[PDB]
Each structure stands twice: as C-alpha cells, then as structure tokens.
Amino acid sequence: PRNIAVLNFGTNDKKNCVTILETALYLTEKYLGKIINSSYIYETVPISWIGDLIPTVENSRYEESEDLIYECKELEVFLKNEKINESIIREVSVEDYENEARRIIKRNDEIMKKYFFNLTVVVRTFVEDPLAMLVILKYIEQIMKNRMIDIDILFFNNYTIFEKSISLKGEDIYKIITKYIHINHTSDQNRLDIIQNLGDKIEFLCIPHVYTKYRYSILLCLNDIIPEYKHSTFEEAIRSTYNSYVESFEEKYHINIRKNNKRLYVLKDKVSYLKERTHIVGILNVNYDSFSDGGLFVDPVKAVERMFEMASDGASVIDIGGESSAPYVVPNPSVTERDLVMPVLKLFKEEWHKLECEVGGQSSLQGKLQKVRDAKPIISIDTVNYDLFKECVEGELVDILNDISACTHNPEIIKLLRRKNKFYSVVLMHKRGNPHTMDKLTNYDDLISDIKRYLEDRLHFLVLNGVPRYRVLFDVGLGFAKKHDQSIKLLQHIHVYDEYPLFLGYSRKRFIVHCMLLYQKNICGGLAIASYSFYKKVDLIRVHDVLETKAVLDVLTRIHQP
Amino acid sequence: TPRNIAVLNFGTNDKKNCVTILETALYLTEKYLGKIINSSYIYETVPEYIVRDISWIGDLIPTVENSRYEESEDLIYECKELEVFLKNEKINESIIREVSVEDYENEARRIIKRNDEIMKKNLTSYFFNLTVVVRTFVEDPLAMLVILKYIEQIMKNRMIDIDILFFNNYTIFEKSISLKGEDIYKIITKYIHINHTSDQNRLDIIQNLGDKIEFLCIPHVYTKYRYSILLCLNDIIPEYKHSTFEEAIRSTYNSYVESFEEKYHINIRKNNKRLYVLKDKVSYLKERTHIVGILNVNYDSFSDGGLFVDPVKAVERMFEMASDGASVIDIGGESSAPYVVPNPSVTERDLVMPVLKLFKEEWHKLECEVGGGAVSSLQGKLQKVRDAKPIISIDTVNYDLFKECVEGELVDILNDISACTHNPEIIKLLRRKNKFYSVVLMHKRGNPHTMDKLTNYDDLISDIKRYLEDRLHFLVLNGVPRYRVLFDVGLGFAKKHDQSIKLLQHIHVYDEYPLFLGYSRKRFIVHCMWRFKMSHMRQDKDQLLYQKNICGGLAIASYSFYKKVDLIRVHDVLETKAVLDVLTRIHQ
Ligand SMILES: Nc1ncnc2c1ncn2[C@@H]1O[C@H](COP(=O)(O)CP(=O)(O)OP(=O)(O)O)[C@@H](O)[C@H]1O
Ligand SMILES: Nc1nc2ncc(COP(=O)(O)OP(=O)(O)O)nc2c(=O)[nH]1
Ligand SMILES: Nc1nc2ncc(COP(=O)(O)OP(=O)(O)O)nc2c(=O)[nH]1
Ligand SMILES: C[C@H]1O[C@@H](n2cnc3c(N)ncnc32)[C@H](O)[C@@H]1O
Ligand SMILES: Nc1nc2nccnc2c(=O)[nH]1
Ligand SMILES: Nc1ccc(C(=O)O)cc1
Numbered sequence A: 001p002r003n004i005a006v007l008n009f010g011t012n013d014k015k016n017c018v019t020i021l022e023t024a025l026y027l028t029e030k031y032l033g034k035i036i037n038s039s040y041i042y043e044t045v046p047i048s049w050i051g052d053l054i055p056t057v058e059n060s061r062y063e064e065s066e067d068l069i070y071e072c073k074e075l076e077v078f079l080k081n082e083k084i085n086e087s088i089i090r091e092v093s094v095e096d097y098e099n100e101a102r103r104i105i106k107r108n109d110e111i112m113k114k115y116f117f118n119l120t121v122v123v124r125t126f127v128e129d130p131l132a133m134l135v136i137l138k139y140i141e142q143i144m145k146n147r148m149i150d151i152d153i154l155f156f157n158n159y160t161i162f163e164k165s166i167s168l169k170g171e172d173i174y175k176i177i178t179k180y181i182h183i184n185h186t187s188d189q190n191r192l193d194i195i196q197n198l199g200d201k202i203e204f205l206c207i208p209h210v211y212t213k214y215r216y217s218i219l220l221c222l223n224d225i226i227p228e229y230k231h232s233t234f235e236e237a238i239r240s241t242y243n244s245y246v247e248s249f250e251e252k253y254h255i256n257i258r259k260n261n262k263r264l265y266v267l268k269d270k271v272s273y274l275k276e277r278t279h280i281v282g283i284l285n286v287n288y289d290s291f292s293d294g295g296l297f298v299d300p301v302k303a304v305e306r307m308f309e310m311a312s313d314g315a316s317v318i319d320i321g322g323e324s325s326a327p328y329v330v331p332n333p334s335v336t337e338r339d340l341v342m343p344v345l346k347l348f349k350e351e352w353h354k355l356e357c358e359v360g361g362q363s364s365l366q367g368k369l370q371k372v373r374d375a376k377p378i379i380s381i382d383t384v385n386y387d388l389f390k391e392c393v394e395g396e397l398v399d400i401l402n403d404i405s406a407c408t409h410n411p412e413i414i415k416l417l418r419r420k421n422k423f424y425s426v427v428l429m430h431k432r433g434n435p436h437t438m439d440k441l442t443n444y445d446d447l448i449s450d451i452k453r454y455l456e457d458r459l460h461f462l463v464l465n466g467v468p469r470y471r472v473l474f475d476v477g478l479g480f481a482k483k484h485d486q487s488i489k490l491l492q493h494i495h496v497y498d499e500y501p502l503f504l505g506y507s508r509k510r511f512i513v514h515c516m517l518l519y520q521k522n523i524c525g526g527l528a529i530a531s532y533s534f535y536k537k538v539d540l541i542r543v544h545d546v547l548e549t550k551a552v553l554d555v556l557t558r559i560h561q562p
Numbered sequence B: 001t002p003r004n005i006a007v008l009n010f011g012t013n014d015k016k017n018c019v020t021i022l023e024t025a026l027y028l029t030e031k032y033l034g035k036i037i038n039s040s041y042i043y044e045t046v047p048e049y050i051v052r053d054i055s056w057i058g059d060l061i062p063t064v065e066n067s068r069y070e071e072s073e074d075l076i077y078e079c080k081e082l083e084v085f086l087k088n089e090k091i092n093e094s095i096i097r098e099v100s101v102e103d104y105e106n107e108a109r110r111i112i113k114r115n116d117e118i119m120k121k122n123l124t125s126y127f128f129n130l131t132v133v134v135r136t137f138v139e140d141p142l143a144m145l146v147i148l149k150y151i152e153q154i155m156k157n158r159m160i161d162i163d164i165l166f167f168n169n170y171t172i173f174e175k176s177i178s179l180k181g182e183d184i185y186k187i188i189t190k191y192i193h194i195n196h197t198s199d200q201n202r203l204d205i206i207q208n209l210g211d212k213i214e215f216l217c218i219p220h221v222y223t224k225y226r227y228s229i230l231l232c233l234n235d236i237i238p239e240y241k242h243s244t245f246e247e248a249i250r251s252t253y254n255s256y257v258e259s260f261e262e263k264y265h266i267n268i269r270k271n272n273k274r275l276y277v278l279k280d281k282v283s284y285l286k287e288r289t290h291i292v293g294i295l296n297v298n299y300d301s302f303s304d305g306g307l308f309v310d311p312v313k314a315v316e317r318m319f320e321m322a323s324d325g326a327s328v329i330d331i332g333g334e335s336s337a338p339y340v341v342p343n344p345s346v347t348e349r350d351l352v353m354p355v356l357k358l359f360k361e362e363w364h365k366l367e368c369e370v371g372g373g374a375v376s377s378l379q380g381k382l383q384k385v386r387d388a389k390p391i392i393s394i395d396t397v398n399y400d401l402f403k404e405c406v407e408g409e410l411v412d413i414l415n416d417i418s419a420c421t422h423n424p425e426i427i428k429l430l431r432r433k434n435k436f437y438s439v440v441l442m443h444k445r446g447n448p449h450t451m452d453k454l455t456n457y458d459d460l461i462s463d464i465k466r467y468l469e470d471r472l473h474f475l476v477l478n479g480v481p482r483y484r485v486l487f488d489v490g491l492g493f494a495k496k497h498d499q500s501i502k503l504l505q506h507i508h509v510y511d512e513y514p515l516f517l518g519y520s521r522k523r524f525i526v527h528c529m530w531r532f533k534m535s536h537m538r539q540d541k542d543q544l545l546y547q548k549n550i551c552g553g554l555a556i557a558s559y560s561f562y563k564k565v566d567l568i569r570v571h572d573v574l575e576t577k578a579v580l581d582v583l584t585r586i587h588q
C-alpha cells in the first residue's frame, strides 16, 4: 500500500512565482508519487536556466502509471486518521509531541523577535518513511538554489513523529537518495557535491510540521483540500480550526484576515488575484458556420490580422474555435476543425516570431524582448478533440483548453494539461447534449445548485488526476441547455461562484434580446451584462466586440478608483 | 394690516388623475386665499385611520368667479410674515376665540378616541398628499374654512380634501358651529364676486355649505398624529413648534419614525413614497431611470450639428426616439458646447418653432386616424395615444421663446441650464392659471468660451449641491411646486474632467431629490481611457473615438441605473434603452 503525504510549497518571488512552484511540483511528483489534490495559490503576509534543468534531471526508480484515476482508497483512509502502514520511524505520544513542539515555537518566537506565495498538495507517495521524503525534498530545493523555494512535510500518514538531533553524512544521504533516484555518477554530470553536504540542512524531523495549526497560511491552503481531517495532535478538524483562527483574529484585532490574504489563479505564467479584475477574452471563430461570424476569418491572414486587432483593442485572451456549437448548426463538412485551426495558429506564431526578430535587430536587448512576450496575448482553444489539442501543446501553439462539456467527451484530454514541466489551464463549461438537442434538455430540479454541483465534481476529478486547482476555471454555459429565463437566472445567482475563478460567454446569444438590424440591440444588451459582470467581479468575459466592451470597463474602472 | 400665514393640507385618493386634481386645487386656493410661498413633495401614503372621471375640470377654470383681492405677480425674495410665523410669534390678534393648550388637548383626544371607535367598528387605495404654505388675505380661520369647503364643492375614494393645519400661532377649538346660507353668503361675498344670474350661479352650493362645517379646530386635530401630515410638513416648516407641540416638526417626525420602527420593525419609508412630476402623472422617486432624447435643431452642435435643421427630418427623429424608448425629448435651438459660436444667420427661435408646431400638427393627425377607425373603446384607444405621446422639454434660457412655447401648448418642461438665472422672470411662466410646468435646474459657471477656465471650487461636491438647493428655495418661494423641480449637476460645464467624474462618484448626495444627468458624448468620458454602428453622428468628427465615447456613455448609463438616477439625457436612445432593459430584467 502507498502512503499519503501532505506538503507545503513556499516562495517569495512574485514575478516568477508560478514557474518556481510548478517546477517544484513537477519534481516532487517525479521523485515521490502522484499528486492527487492541490490548493489554490495564496498571497499571504508572514530563471533563464530553469528550462535547462528539465532534460538533465535524473530519472526515478519508480514509475507510476499515466492512467486517469477515479478514486484513491489510501486517501480515504488518511482522511479518517486511520492506519495505513506501520510507522518505520519511532512514533511519540501527543503529550510529548506538544511539549517539544511548543518549546521550538517559543524559541523561534524569541529569535525572530528582534509577501509569501503558498500552496498545499497531497502526494500518493511510494516512499516508505518521512525521513526519506524529507531528504528528497531538500535535494530538489538545492537542485534549484526563505526566499527561493521551501517544501515542508505537514502530514505523513497519521504518524505523530518527533526526532531531535538527526545527523546525516554524505554516505547516509547517498544510501537514501539512490534507493529512490537513478543518480548520474559521471564526471561531466553529477550533483555529488550537493549530495555530500545535504545533511547540514537537516537537524530534526517533526510530523505534523508543528506550525501547521499555528499558521494562517497553512490552514488557509489545507482548508481547500482536507477540511474534514483531524490528526490526533489537533483538537478539532482543519475547517473548524481555520474557522476558530479567522474568528479569534477578527475578534481580537477587528481587521479582516481575508483583506491581506488573497486567493490567486493562473492563466498562463503569472498569478492573478482572484476577483480583482475582469479580463477580456476576444473571440475568433475560424469556420464557415458560426452565428454572427461565419466565414469572416477562415483565410489565415484575415484571422491573424484580427487577433492582432483584438489584442490591441484590449483583449487579454484569444479563443480560437474551429467548429460551431450554436443551436441546430451543421458544421461545414468540406473542411475539418483541425484543418481550419492549425494554419491560423501556426501563422500567428510565425508572425509573432518575426515580431521578436525584428525587435531583436530596460532598453537593452533582454529589456526589449521581455516587453514583447509580456504582452503576448494568451491563446485559448475551443475544442473537445484529443488529437487536435495534442498537436497544439506539442507545437507550443496554445495556453488554455476551453472544453465546452468539461472534458466529458473524452476525459483522456486531461492528461495533456500537464506535460512535464509545462502546465496548461482549462475552462470547464456546463452543457448537456449537442447542438440539435441541447434546447430540449432544460429540466433541472434546482437549476443553480445542480450546475454548481456539476462543475464542482468535474473539478474534483481534475485535481485528483493532477491538474492544479488554480488552473481550473468555471463556466455556467449561458445558452447551453438553458431556456432564456434560465440563462438570466444563472446571472442572477452568479454570487454562488464567488469563491471560484469564473468565465462567462454571453456575447450575441439569444437570451440577451429576450430581455426586451437589431444586432445593434443585442450587442448593447451585451455591454450591460459586461457592467453587471464588472460589478459582480467576474474574472473573465468572452465577447466578440472587444473595443466596445473595453470602453465600458475603462469607464467603470475609473469611476471606481479612490 | 399684515397678512396671515396658513398651512393647508391637500389630499386625494385618485392616482391616475392625481396631479390635475391637486393642481386644480392649488389654483383655486391661490386665487381665493393668497400667494403660495411654499410646498412639499407629493407623497404616496398608507391610510391612517387609527391613532376616474375629470373630463369636466378644464371647462371649470374660465367660468370661476374672480377674487375681490389681487396679489402682484412680481418675483419676491423674502416673506416677513413667514419668518414671524416660524417663531410662533403673533401676527394679528385672533378675531375668533382662542383656547388654552390643556383645553385644546382634552377636546382633541375625545374627537380622536371617538374616530378610532368609528373606524374600529369599520373593518382599497393609497393617499396622495401635499401640504402648502399660504400668505393669506383672509382675516380668520373660519372664513378660510368656508372658502375651502366652497372650493371642494366646486369640484365634487375622496376626490379632494383640503384642511387647515395651522393658521398663525392660534390655538382654537369651537365645538359646535352652525352657519346658515345667509352666514355663508356674507362670508364668501366678502372675498369673491359671486355670479348672481339665473343661467349662471352656485347658490345651491352656497346655501348648504354649512352642513359641511361642524366644528373648528386649529391646529388640525390630527396634525401631530399622522405620519402623512408630519411627513409633508417636514419639507416646509421643520423648525416650527406650535404651543400644542412638545417639540418642533422635524423632532416630532423623527420621534414618530423611531417609535414605528422600534415597534412594528418595518421601514416606514418603504410604504410611504416621495413623488415627483414631469408632466401629468406622479413618478415614484428613485424607482426608475427614464431616458431623455436629445434633439439639436441647429447648425452648430458638437455631434448632431446640421442633421436636424430641416423640420421634417427633425420631426421624424422625434418619432423614432419615442419609438426607441425615450420618455422625454429635449429640443435645443442653440449650442452650449465648449468654444462654440452660434450661427449668427438664423435665430434660436426660428429654428425651434417650425419643429415644435409641426410635431403637434403631426401628433394630432395620429389621434384623428386612431379615432376615426384606423391605427378599450373610443375612450380607451384615445387614452392610450395620449399616454404614448412623449413629454417635451425645451432647452433654452430665453423668456421670449418659452413664452411663445407655453402660449401655444408646445412644451411640457423648461430645461434651463442657468438654473433660471439668466432671466429670473422666466419662473412666472412656469405657472399659468390652471397649467403648471416642470423645470430642470442645472449648474454651470460662465459661458461656452470661459466655462473651462472657472474650475476652482472650495468644495466641489457640496458647493454645487448648495447652489442647487438655493435655486430650489427661490422657485418654491415664488410658487413653483417642489415636486416639479429637478436637479442636474451639469457635467462638463465649468468642471475639469476629474471633477465631472468626482461628481458622479458622489452622486448619492442627491439621494433625496429628483435628479437629471447628461453625460452623453461629453469629453470626460474618453478621458477615462453584426457590427456596431453609431447613428445620428456628424460625419465630420472622429468615428473610431466616438465609438468609444458612445460605449462609455453606456457605462454611465449602467452606473446611473444602479445609483437610481431619475433621468438620463442621451443621443443614443436605442442603445441606452437596450442597456436599461437588460439590467431591468436581471434585477426582477
Ligand atoms: N382645518 C380644520 N380645522 C378644524 N376642523 C376642520 C378642518 N377642516 C375640516 N374640519 C371639520 O372636519 C369635519 C369633517 O370634515 P372633513 O374635512 O371632510 C373630515 P375628513 O376629510 O374625512 O378627515 P381629515 O380632515 O382628517 O382629512 C367638518 O365638521 C369640518 O368643519
Ligand atoms: N467557455 C465557453 N466557450 C464558448 N464557446 C463558444 C460559445 C458560442 O459562441 P460563438 O463562438 O460566437 O458561437 P459558435 O459556437 O457558433 O462559434 N459559447 C461559449 C461559452 O458560453 N463558454
Ligand atoms: N439639463 C441639461 N441640459 C443640457 N443641454 C445640453 C447639453 C450639451 O449637450 P448637446 O445638446 O449634445 O450639445 P449642444 O449644447 O452643443 O447642443 N448638456 C446638458 C446637460 O448636461 N444638462
Ligand atoms: C530548514 C530546517 O527545516 C526543517 N524542516 C523542513 N521540513 C520539516 C518537517 N516537515 N518537519 C521537521 N522539520 C522540517 C529541516 O530539518 C531543517 O533543519
Ligand atoms: N394618510 C392619510 N390618512 C388619512 N386619513 C384620513 C383622511 N385622509 C387621509 C389622507 O389623506 N391620508
Ligand atoms: N454556441 C451557442 C451559440 C449561441 C447560443 C444562443 O444564442 O443561445 C447558444 C450556444
């Protein structure tokens, strides 16, 4: 049986925050087991070589399967604080653990008495003890190098461990790494300097990490993934413990603990503050039969001129579609989804690579080239097709999977979202049926609750199969198996996603005009919804009339500046 | 002989014909009693019991006998009788017998106790309520009451009811008054040239008017015990404290409000609402955002110039606009835009008249097709048309033009961008016999060529609000109804762009008043930063930039919907309407 470890990841670098954490995740999963749950990233109050690291890292002596999983019996057992495996390392009693914990916390309090980006993860580990895991985590750190990256073990199974005075020499360390890693012995590549001094970075071991119930940041992350867990060291479960921290703090100091401590999501390479902006997603139908667009952008050169336009016009994201999903549509049978889309993506990249070479020949050469890729519009593909999406992430042609129907069409597409070092974010929309039948499928016992419940289960599936929680965006699918009164109701109750990253697509849909040559009327109705969306703090809105949506939000933003 | 100050309370049950009924009653009242020098809002109140045909009204106005007295219609700036009244000091000695405060209270509480009993045994509508201050030439409260009974009868749910709430500082209770026709005649004919002819008289009324007067009671029995009365008087005499009152009006209103909420635990304001009036009907304050459609009939307007000079086009445009959702249309003959020089070859008046008259000519052809058997009965069909007709506001500061407009029944609202300061005389034109007119007081400084230079305020938000409130006090003193006076902060007029924005930011200070805004196509919008077509946009100016200016427009339109602005004034009616519909839908 596999063990369960819960880890904590820390950095101080905001600029590079994602690349550092995700690189540290890649390597953890590699040398330790599958990552089967994760928190969001959290901003809390107390790299030009990183790519080169990946094809030089040493392989693991354990290979886990790439297969999708739907369950994890060990996780279910961890969570009940029940026994999975005899502890190799000596356990201690709760009373001795809390004595020797509380001593280290008062001493640490004394020394210090003279932002952080965070993440919890759950690992289904093939490592047999805590100590070994710890030695492996130190290795990964040094391979990179509390500034840079910090990985701590919070819970390893249900064990209560406390070991002072651990001294490990270059022999001990070697014996432990090479039980788990194929280490390179060769002169022209090795890390045997590192392995030799890795005992200097370990003086003691202690599960649970004993700041676990005493640090908001930790509780805050653990609250996303193991709210019901109650280690024996704890007097109440993580969510109850969280709640007794927030409450006490807001009672004692009467400031909102939420104010400085913020949830973050990621789209591409940088962190976003959840709910703190409404980005624009420019639409680009590259096909012969979309309502409102068909055929305008089939030619790759008109389709690329247009991307460049919306980018300029204000859109943060661009969302390519090769095939309509609109009511009673019959996709153009003369050219496929893939044939339409590939040239246009491929043309975009080549056009951006001419841009980058024309710039290549602040104010320096890197200063100039960093301003160019620092405004590259994010590219989001609107498909459900394994083989096309594969071809996009293999050629470096997209950043975001927009799977309408939440990766239920072919769940295997989920495995392409993590590619080695490279992660990719995903939009899970709600919908039923297909274009001819969706209208007819509108019975819900509890429209609002049911749909939230649908998306939440899809999320649990994706995080369990190793997609980071902070890359998953929701969408209620306005117009997709809703009547117009239902579509409007979903907007009315949009406050139920107030804890989640949220993406909406109203643009040009029929329900808009149901509120009232009259394309004019529908676009304007849209701009209203954009205001509503602004005030509801929707995270991303997906629209065709970028220039005009921009105008709205500029005005709305200005009015609401202190 | 100084004049007396009386405070009257008007009350009706008929919501559809509400405005006409009260404004008919204010006309007769001013005519026979004095000058109206102050007024409250109208309020929709829930009846306090326990402590629709008017097609004859118009033809009553010119047939009413004259007052023997006559006030000068000159503008006034003060009323000493009032000042005095407000300190509960004496004006004139009471002809009628006064009574001690303790005897007064005793007799009142019997009348109230007995009314409660009546109504307890008993057990349909709301009450629309207005209060008014009159500087009066009637020498005593009884004679006034007789003139009020006369007025009511001249008209006759309870259709109209007019009571004397205060008459000077007097404290009076006459328990059983008995006036025969002779007595009534003596009293009315001292103040009115009554017709004496067989084919024209009201001697059947005058003779029996006594039946309608059983006692006399100043202050009114219920003055301090009805929210609806306190609610009104809080507008007009808040600081007053009679001898019967343990504290002033405002203190007493807040006492009432706390007591209510600290008992029945509901908000008293939720079910008693402030109304305002644009033309012929009540509008519930803050309950809606209406769209005002801009019509510039001149060669020099910053975005419309030269499009609507031809009357036929300009009149089509007014039909398009009403169709597209505009509740009011605002015709403007001269431009006030920055640095503009108005075309000196044709006059504001020349431009606006052929239009306003054509439109009337046209609308009347509509009614005649409908009536005829083209385009609910006859009465039904024809009522619908008139309810459909757009309100007309005229944007000018010219006495001679507004005189002409009003004289021909061509407009319904003065939109005076100078807050009626260019020519204060224009105020006397807001009230013409039976017919009253609503007015929009906007804040500007300077003129199109100097406004931009006049942007030093000590306190922008509060200075503009003071100004507007002073302009309101001046109009209400000169007899314009407060429910017809609308505020506008004047965006872009003698404000820097940051200052226009700021005014929007603190627009909540107008949370108590009717509010009119015009952001449309102004400069400050763009300072913040299946196809879209602008319409009714000069081909001369920046096409791409005004796409952005118009759509920023729509953002304020949304913002305005949320802040509860009463009227927005826009070029893009179709679009603004689209936004308002959707937002409306989302919020049911
Ligand atoms: N201002 C006033 N002061 C004293 N008595 C008054 C008065 N106005 C009316 N009355 C008296 O009130 C009696 C009933 O007349 P109405 O005014 O019709 C009662 P109402 O209208 O049902 O109640 P309300 O006056 O409280 O609105 C008459 O005998 C009349 O003399
Ligand atoms: N996440 C998400 N993606 C979407 N993609 C397409 C459309 C339909 O819009 P459009 O692209 O204009 O039409 P077509 O499907 O015909 O391309 N709607 C959504 C949506 O609501 N949510
Ligand atoms: N009450 C009020 N009336 C107004 N009239 C005209 C203009 C200017 O707009 P427009 O008519 O388009 O320009 P011009 O004055 O050049 O006709 N602004 C206002 C305003 O803000 N408030
Ligand atoms: C930098 C210091 O942090 C300690 N450290 C890191 N993670 C853990 C854990 N889960 N338990 C105990 N100690 C830990 C190392 O032992 C080192 O001494
Ligand atoms: N609120 C209210 N109450 C009343 N009670 C009796 C008579 N009139 C009225 C009236 O006009 N309004
Ligand atoms: N793909 C879609 C396109 C349009 C609509 C809609 O108009 O309701 C719904 C789905």
Ligand SMILES: Nc1ccc(C(=O)O)cc1
Binding pocket: B302, B335, B336, B337, B338, B491, B492, B493, B521, B522, B523, B524
């Ligand atoms: N009448 C006016 C027209 C325009 C502006 C403005 O754009 O600032 C101000 C006043």
Ligand SMILES: [Mg+2]
Binding pocket: B295, B296, B301, B332, B333, B334, B335, B336, B395
């Ligand atoms: Mg004008």
